[PDB]
């Protein structure tokens, strides 16, 4: 419970903020990899817009 | 005789940039597979303990 509840407001803040990151892009983030192939995406986004 | 070290020259610099955008390629592919554990800890240390 200790563990738990020490990490019991960080998960939620990690939920909390990432739903807001996940708001800020059109796509919705659903998974770690998902969010690596999004960020990857994003990159090769940006190096094609520059 | 002159054009020869002007292509020399553009081929160097298209290798370069050929270079480059391999690079850059393999760095987006990594991170598309590998930013979820990049810099994490070792486990095998804390096996062996």
Redesign the interface.
């Known amino acids: 419970i200790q563990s738990l509840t020490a990490r019991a407001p960080v998960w939620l803040a990690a939920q909390d903020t990432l739903n807001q990151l996940c708001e800020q892009s059109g796509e919705t983030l659903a998974s770690?990899?998902d969010?690596?192939?999004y960020?990857?995406?994003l990159?090769?986004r940006e190096?094609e817009a520059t | 005789l002159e054009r020869d070290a002007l292509a020399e020259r553009y081929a160097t610099l298209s290798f370069d940039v050929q270079k480059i955008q391999r690079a850059?390629q393999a760095?987006?592919?990594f991170?598309?597979?590998?930013?979820?554990v990049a810099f994490d800890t070792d486990p095998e240390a804390e096996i062996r303990e």
Do not use: A, C, D
């Not at chain 2, 991170?31 to 979820?36: F, I, N, Q, Y």
């Open positions: 770690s990899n969010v690596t192939e960020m990857q995406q990159l090769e190096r | 850059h760095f987006s592919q991170v598309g597979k590998h930013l979820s």
